[PDB]
Amino acid sequence: LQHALDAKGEREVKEIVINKDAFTENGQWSIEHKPSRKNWRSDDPSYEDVTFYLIIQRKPLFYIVYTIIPCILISILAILVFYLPPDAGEKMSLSISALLAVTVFLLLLADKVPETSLSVPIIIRYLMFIMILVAFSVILSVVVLNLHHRSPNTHTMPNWIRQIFIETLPPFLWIQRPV
Amino acid sequence: YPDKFPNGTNYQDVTFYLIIRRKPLFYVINFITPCVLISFLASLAFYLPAESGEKMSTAISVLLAQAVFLLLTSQRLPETALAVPLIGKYLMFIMSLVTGVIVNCGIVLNFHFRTPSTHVLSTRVKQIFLEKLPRILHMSR
Amino acid sequence: LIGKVIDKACFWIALLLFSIGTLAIFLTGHFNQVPEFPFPGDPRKYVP
Amino acid sequence: ASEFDDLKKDWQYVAMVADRLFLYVFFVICSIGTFSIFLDASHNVPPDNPFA
Amino acid sequence: SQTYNAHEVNLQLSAEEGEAVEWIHIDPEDFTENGEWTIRHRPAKKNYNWQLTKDDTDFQEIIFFLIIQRKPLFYIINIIAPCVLISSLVVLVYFLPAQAGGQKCTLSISVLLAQTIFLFLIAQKVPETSLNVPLIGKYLIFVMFVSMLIVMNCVIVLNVSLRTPNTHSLSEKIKHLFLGFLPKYLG
Amino acid sequence: TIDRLSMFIITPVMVLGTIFIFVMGNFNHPPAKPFEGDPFDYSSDHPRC
Amino acid sequence: IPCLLFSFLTGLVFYLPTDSGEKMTLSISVLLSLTVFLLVIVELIPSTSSAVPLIGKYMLFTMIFVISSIIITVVVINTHHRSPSTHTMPQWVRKIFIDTIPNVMFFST
Amino acid sequence: IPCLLFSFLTGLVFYLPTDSGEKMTLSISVLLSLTVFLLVIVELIPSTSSAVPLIGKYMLFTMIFVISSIIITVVVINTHHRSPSTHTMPQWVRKIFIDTIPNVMFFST
Ligand SMILES: *[C@@H]1O[C@H](CO)[C@@H](O[C@@H]2O[C@H](CO)[C@@H](O[C@@H]3O[C@H](CO[C@H]4O[C@H](CO[C@H]5O[C@H](CO)[C@@H](O)[C@H](O)[C@@H]5O)[C@@H](O)[C@H](O)[C@@H]4O)[C@@H](O)[C@H](O)[C@H]3NC(C)=O)[C@H](O)[C@H]2NC(C)=O)[C@H](O)[C@H]1NC(C)=O
Ligand SMILES: *[C@@H]1O[C@H](CO)[C@@H](O[C@@H]2O[C@H](CO)[C@@H](O[C@@H]3O[C@H](CO)[C@@H](O)[C@H](O)[C@@H]3O)[C@H](O)[C@H]2NC(C)=O)[C@H](O)[C@H]1NC(C)=O
Ligand SMILES: *[C@@H]1O[C@H](CO)[C@@H](O[C@@H]2O[C@H](CO)[C@@H](O[C@@H]3O[C@H](CO)[C@@H](O)[C@H](O)[C@@H]3O)[C@H](O)[C@H]2NC(C)=O)[C@H](O)[C@H]1NC(C)=O
Ligand SMILES: *[C@@H]1O[C@H](CO)[C@@H](O)[C@H](O)[C@H]1NC(C)=O
């Protein structure tokens, strides 16, 4: 086995040939390299093949428009929930609806991700990151509401909570209440 | 094809072209009209009084409906990357405006629930939000 | 107090309705069993 | 009633302060994680020598 | 036979040791059961179409039957039990307070939404014929109609519980109808 | 007041953006001539020779 | 049958008093259920563009019915939390909705 | 992992005070998220009836866990909004839930 020669045959062609008159670009894949090399096997003297390689880069616009922008908007909501006042009562609604939306996005992607177990794709890592972040937003919103609905008939304020949240933190966070 | 030679099999071909336009009616009925009329409601969220506890629920449910239309649309086109379909462009634009409505409602709420024990009513904020803007927006008394 | 009496009565009606419907439907399913003979009117079992 | 009110307002103030803290913490964590993932994804290009 | 008629070939069943084999043969040792279907009966018979003659090729035929029962386990675990347990929540609305904050409508309409998702899940599994309605779809229609009745009951109890003298007049006929003997005959 | 302002700002952008985006797509017609640099119509009703 | 159910529910919202904070919850949840049912309609109905089927005309009637209910609910809620400090009841509204329909209304209490 | 997350959240509802009217919102929305994730399970997992898988036993444990949380939450809400006039608190509940438990617990405020 050898390599094919060029049109005016003097020299070998060590790559995949593409004819511009007949070639349809893929639309999802850019061909970066296309070499060609003979391969042997030291254990098998009778083996010889001619392999053609196609190094191809994916164009991810579809996945950007259908997965990353919605997740950025969900993360914006999950940070917004801490700006709400507890007297509004729309806090659990915001947090848990964000969770339901991330579940819908997971459903959306359930049919488009490779089903191999040698690694986890970065897009699924990003989705699980956002999902766990929304979950922790839910947990801390519950904690905030619990602290907000406390009263002397049920709880007595300890000293470490008072020190940390009435003297140490407000000066940093620039939230000193009116004297 | 003059770059090739008449002694090969790549020099000649007869091609037949079909230019076909899509009749948009299925999509106009099952996707566009529902999505546009559900999306308009997120702006009606700005007319609900704050003393109702449903300003946020309305806009967030509109965003969940949009996420269901996004799931439906994601299944009809190829995953090519030469352009963004007009439908996906509308989807991203409308979902980002609904997200902005949700954030703006959260800010209205934050300002509504302020009390002398936690915040101060600036004379500046009383100059902007209490006499000039109302008169410009032509609001009741 | 008027609405609390309505709920208690309507509770006792809704519980019965849901339970009886569920049980009837699914016990019909459970009782749908294959006949005993391959051909109804035949007294043979057709087995080796 | 005034005394009960003051002691309930202290709890509400604690809640508001914890809320502002959590807000900043979540903003920082979200930004950092999102950027680190996006940079990791942007620096994944094929090499220059196909090694073949 | 696709070519020959009853004047040419005579189709019969096999007879081993003098006794006919009127059944499908199944190796008891090596046979692997399906996964969803259990074989109850496996008979076989020679049939004739009497609308035809012995000059046709479709007058005689050997038929093998397979009467199979279904293993309803995937459906019980993934659909039946989740949907029954979720639809049983609509009776908890009668113990919630009839005021702003009880969330009687929240709970009932959310159970309806969950049933609407179970409709899509079943929609992907049921046969598409139109001679009878399946049992699963019949049960879904039943529970969704019960959920709608309980939503209407929640709306009527909230309407009654939030009435005021400025809006409605409470009459002695009512008070005597609901606060004289009915609570006694009830709770 | 912040709410009346957010209305008088968000609602126009939403209506005008929807109208624009969909009218733009409604006016997308095939070029009415099969090949750009060619006056022929390639129609069965009007052969060239 | 689901579309029939959703239309009846779309009508129920108008007997729920605004004092409870659940009119928008109810309306918008009916709309959400209908939007999730759209997934079953799209899975089952034929996706052809020769004409609009009768089943599709009915689905779209239900959609606009729900959305109109939601809009009118927001106008009812706004009319209820109306502060006298800023809005004075006009003479036509006080004549039509206090001294005419109440009396005309027969099936009532 | 999503099922683990949903179970951990399913326990959280018991730290949410009844004063806020959002216990049912949280519980039922967790249930809604689990019901939507059931479509993902039914899509990814093989659909066989030879036996119950371990992943399916876990999904049904999570389901029954959520539903039990909802029932006991409704009993907590009912015990919270209990009118004093009618229900005269009995001695055994008063002794148990007022004298012994508050003291036996320590990691509390
Ligand atoms: C699963 O499905 C199969 C069908 O795919 C079911 O099988 C059916 O089971 C029925 C009940 O066991 C059978 O009914 C019995 O049929 C036989 C034979 O009937 C045929 O011959 C009749 C007589 O023909 C003479 O008279 C005619 C009229 O004068 C003349 O035209 C003709 O030339 C002859 O002189 C004929 O009248 C009839 O129309 C048939 O052609 C009867 O003898 C029995 O009395 C029937 N009843 C019973 C209780 O056995 C039915 O034949 C059979 N069909 C097939 C295709 O095998 C099976 O039962 C199902 N299993 C389940 C549901 O578990
Ligand atoms: C794409 O995949 C192919 C096949 O898996 C890769 O080709 C293989 O690459 C390895 C590493 O470069 C080669 O091994 C090396 O071969 C040279 C030959 O002179 C030797 O000197 C080195 O010590 C080493 O053994 C291997 O021969 C080569 N071919 C095959 C068929 O395996 C290729 O590198 C991959 N390309 C990229 C960009 O990853
Ligand atoms: C439908 O597709 C066909 C091709 O499949 C289009 O015909 C081809 O269009 C290209 C681009 O317009 C033409 O190339 C041009 O050629 C001229 C002359 O050499 C040059 O000056 C331009 O820069 C460009 O390269 C090509 O000649 C033409 N013909 C063929 C046979 O390929 C056709 O226009 C398309 N129709 C529509 C309505 O889009
Ligand atoms: C085809 O024609 C070209 C140009 O004259 C020439 O170089 C080539 O050798 C020819 N091929 C054959 C097979 O004759």
* DSSP state string for chain A: --PPBPSS-SSB--B----GGG----SSEEEEE-BEEEEEETTEEEEEEEEE--EEEE--HHHIIIIIHHHHHHHHHHHHGGGS-GGG--HHHHHHHHHHHHHHHHHHHTTTS---SS---HHHHHHHHHHHHHHHHHHHHHHHHHHHT--TTT----HHHHHIIIIIHHHHHT-PPP-
- Which residues in A lie closer than 8 A to residue H109 (C-beta atoms)? 155-158
Q: Which atom of ligand 1 is nearest to the CA of C35?
A: 64
Q: How buried is G10 (Cβ within 10 angstroms: 0-12 exposed, 13-18 middle, 19+ buried)? A: buried
CA distance E160 to chain C (A): 6
Structure tokens that stand for A76 in this block: 């914006």
Cα of A24 to ligand 2 centre, how many Å?
Answer: 29
**Cα angle D33, D34, D37; round to 5:** 85
Identity of the residue numbered B4: K
Chains B and D are in contact, defined as 3 or more C-beta pairs closer than 8 angstroms: yes
Question: Could you tell me which of H53, F22, B65, G80 has the C-alpha nearest to residue A100?
Answer: B65
- Chain E residues with beta carbon closer than 8 angstroms to that of G44: 123
Residues of E in Cβ contact (< 8 Å) with C26: 80, 139
Distance (Å) from the C-alpha of residue G41 to the closest C-alpha of chain E? 9
CB B102 within 8 A of CB B67: no
Number of C-beta neighbours around residue B140 at 10 A: 10
Beta-strand runs (E) in chain A: 29-33, 36-41, 44-52, 55-58
The residue length of chain H stands at 109
CA of E5 to the centre of ligand 4 (A): 66
For residue D49, give the ligand 2 atom closest to its CA: 38
CB contact under 8 A, A178 and B117: yes
Listed resolution, Å: 2.3
Q: How far apart are CA B105 and CA B111, in angstroms?
A: 10
Position G56, amino acid: G
**Residues in A touching H5 (Cβ below 8 Å):** 131-132, 135
Is there a contact between D44 and A173 (Cβ–Cβ < 8 Å)? no
A79 C-beta neighbours (distance < 10 Å), count: 22
Cα of C27 to nearest chain E Cα, Å:
11
What's the CA gap between E80 and H53, in Å, rounded? 17
- Residue whose CA lies nearest to ligand 1 atom number 45: C41
Contact E114 H32 (CB under 8 A): yes
For residue H24, the chain E residues in CB contact (below 8 A) are 96, 103, 106-107
Q: What is the DSSP letter of E48?
A: E
Count the Cβ atoms, other than its own, within 10 Å of residue A112. Answer: 14
Q: How far is the CA of B5 from the centre of ligand 4 (A)?
A: 7
Task: Give the technique used to solve this structure.
Answer: cryo-EM
Set of chain B residues whose Cβ sits within 8 Å of the Cβ of D13:
117-118
Task: Decide: F39 and B82 in contact? Cβ < 8 Å.
Answer: no
* Separation CA A15–CA D46 (nearest Å): 18
Residue entry with tokens 């309409």: E109
For residue E47, what are its two tokens?
Answer: 């049939």
What's the length of chain C?
Answer: 48
Cross-chain residue pair E158–G20, CB shorter than 8 Å: yes
Compute the 3-state secondary structure of chain B and give helix, strand, coil in percent, each to the nearest 5. Answer: 55, 0, 45
Read off the tokens for F24: 């733009």
For residue B20, the ligand closest to its alpha carbon is 3
Interface test with E, best of C12, C16, C22 (most E CBs within 10 A): C22
Residues E119 and G40 sit within 8 Å (Cβ to Cβ)? yes
Query: Which of B35, B58, B62, B75 to mutate: most G Cβ within 10 Å?
Result: B58
| H75 in contact with chain A, both atoms CB, cutoff 8 A | no
- Chains H and D physically touch (3 or more Cβ atom pairs below 8 Å): no
Nearest atom (ligand 4) to Cα of B5: 2
Alpha carbon nearest to ligand 1 atom 12, residue: C39
Mutation to probe ligand 1, out of C32, C36, C39 (largest number of atoms < 8 A from CB): C39
